[PDB]
């Protein structure tokens, strides 16, 4: 099958060319659908604050990268300041989302890479891949972290609700937990959120995706967490991944998100995991076993020389059944 | 000299220094007043973290300084992680209270330096000055910032009531919120937190010490938060001095702690207030008017040139009167 269409704006260099290489599509650039999707899922103080920070951050005569030196962590209150690095702090978990010249123009324009590829799913297409950079997996409604701006695959399921799905689901098969999907959808029974991620207990982000975070309110029994030890390797992660997909097809999902971060690989220099490319091409055709159409969003990653055959070898092996 | 300086072992040579030319009184050494002291205030488990904190980052072959990067801050859990740098981020709420080979002796030091001046106190002396390094009032029951790894003001507060006293009052006039002491008694009454500080709204810590935050349970009214605005100079920092310590009065007070920073002096750089080397002095008389036992201890200001002229010129006014 040549059908899955690549959605582009060193490390897509490696992407983009095996996806020319292995024949998984077209590639075609963005369209701008504004603001307001984006807005459907970070709230309007956060996405202007995003907005202005790097002006604001210039108006100082700031050198360098914005950065939070101050979090509302324990014992302190959640209360948002005026000043610009109080704001920030307020906006973030860690001082892993710096913000510079291009950082909003960059993250606005990874969400309308998803949400074109989301567009194609609309108009008939039964898979694409949204090739995100930055990230987005990390990121809540008002917090923005680990590398992540904008939450680009709750954007492009938020969008699939809007028009008229019922339910949907996200699968994060990124090596870190989708803690930002997990807390936007938290309280919903309309998206279901599965992650397979290194156990919080040692692993970034530490402070959430325990196996005991099922939802709140409404959304009790739609978050489903699968924490591994570190060492895992394909007969753990893949049970994970067969129980996470047979979740999925239970709730009835009609569109499926996968959260596409491929630094579970043992030569990713972040990763604990030990998957080796052949396990791609498992999971994809796994992930294909599901019979939905199926929207892949780029998240994580370590530029290493095979990232471009990891991330294609999923695509691959969803063509491939 | 009638007060008595306690010091351990470079803003302390200008200090110690102005505390001999001055005749403040004699300078001693610390006794060693063990842990539980310091266990009235933090947890075990806080202290036994701190205490092994370097150790294992050295049998992980940590490279330098060890410092947190993640924080449950909004939409994470509080909820302690086993990994060293995640328990790190638990026990934190910035990047600003590293941890390296001499750290935790250097905090169980200062500690032990304000409980020998607070013992000096119990023994029938009037006042004695804590030349504590590092500070503590940025340090809650188990939350580390700040350059402050345990509240050394808090641990001298409670040695006073486990001493017999049934009422103290801690008075913070360093330029920042004392959030970590406000934190350690904020369900207390029989300890009433004031702070005057830059309005948290623009200053460090940022997420607290509003005018709104009165207290919690029967410690509700017993916390008294004095924010002010950028560039504000005596005649509204002594009038917010002045309705402290009139509301440590109506308390009854049996002893008053001074948490002592002197980073509200215009040229100190940190400093948004504009209070000039003479207000210090006023500053001391103001706290003796109140007619109290007083313990002094060293918090916040930068190593300008007048830290030690600022610094005694409260304990100059403090026994001018
Ligand atoms: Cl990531
Ligand atoms: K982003
Ligand atoms: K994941
Ligand atoms: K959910
Ligand atoms: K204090
Ligand atoms: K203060
Ligand atoms: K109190
Ligand atoms: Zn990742
Ligand atoms: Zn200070």
Same mark, same amino acid.
């Given at each position: ?5 690549? @959605? &582009? ?5 490696? /992407? ?7 024949? @998984? +599509? ?9 603001r307001?999707? /984006?807005?459907?899922? #970070? ?13 604001? =951050?210039?108006e ?8 939070? &030196? ?14 610009? #690095?109080?704001?920030? %702090?307020? &906006?973030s ?5 710096? @913000?510079?010249?291009?950082? =909003? ?7 309308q ?10 108009? +008939?297409?039964?898979s $694409? ?6 990230? %987005? ?16 695959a ?5 969008a699939?609700?809007?028009?008229? #799905? ?8 990124? &090596?870190?937990?989708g803690?930002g ?20 207990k ?11 975070? #099922? ?14 030890? $570190?060492?895992?390797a ?5 049970? $994970?991944?067969?129980?996470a997909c ?10 499926? @998100?996968?959260s ?8 990713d ?21 599901? +019979? ?5 969003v780029?998240?994580?990653?370590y ?13 691959? %092996?969803?063509?491939?059944?």
């Amino acid at each position: 099958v040549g059908t899955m269409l690549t @959605i &582009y704006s060193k490390r897509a260099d490696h /992407i983009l060319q095996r996806v020319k290489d292995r024949n @998984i +599509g077209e590639i075609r650039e963005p369209q701008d659908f504004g603001r307001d999707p /984006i807005q459907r899922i #970070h709230t309007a103080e956060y996405l202007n604050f995003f907005e202005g920070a790097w002006a604001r =951050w210039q108006e100082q005569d700031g050198t360098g990268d914005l950065l939070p &030196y101050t979090w509302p962590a324990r014992t302190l209150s959640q209360r948002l300041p005026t000043s610009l #690095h109080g704001q920030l %702090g307020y &906006y973030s978990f860690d001082a892993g989302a710096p @913000i510079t010249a291009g950082t =909003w123009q960059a993250a606005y324009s990874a969400a309308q890479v998803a949400l074109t590829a989301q567009h194609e799913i609309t108009n +008939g297409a039964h898979s $694409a891949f949204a090739l995100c950079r930055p990230p %987005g997996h990390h990121a809540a409604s008002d917090v923005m972290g680990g590398y992540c701006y904008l939450n680009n695959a709750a954007i492009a399921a938020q969008a699939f609700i809007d028009q008229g #799905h019922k339910r949907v689901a996200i699968l994060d098969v990124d &090596y870190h937990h989708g803690n930002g999907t997990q807390s936007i959808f938290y309280s919903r029974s309309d998206v279901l959120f599965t992650s397979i991620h290194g156990d919080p207990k040692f692993e970034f982000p530490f402070f959430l995706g325990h196996a005991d975070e #099922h939802g709140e309110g409404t959304g009790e029994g739609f978050n489903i967490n699968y924490p591994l030890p $570190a060492g895992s390797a394909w007969d753990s992660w893949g049970a $994970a991944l067969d129980d996470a997909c047979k979740r999925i097809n239970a709730f009835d999902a009609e569109v499926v @998100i996968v959260s596409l971060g491929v630094d579970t690989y043992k030569e990713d220099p972040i990763s604990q995991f030990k998957l080796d490319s052949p396990d791609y091409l498992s999971m994809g055709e796994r992930i294909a076993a599901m +019979g939905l159409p199926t929207l892949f969003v780029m998240e994580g990653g370590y530029a290493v020389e095979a990232i471009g055959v990891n991330a294609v070898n999923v695509l691959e %092996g969803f063509e491939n059944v």
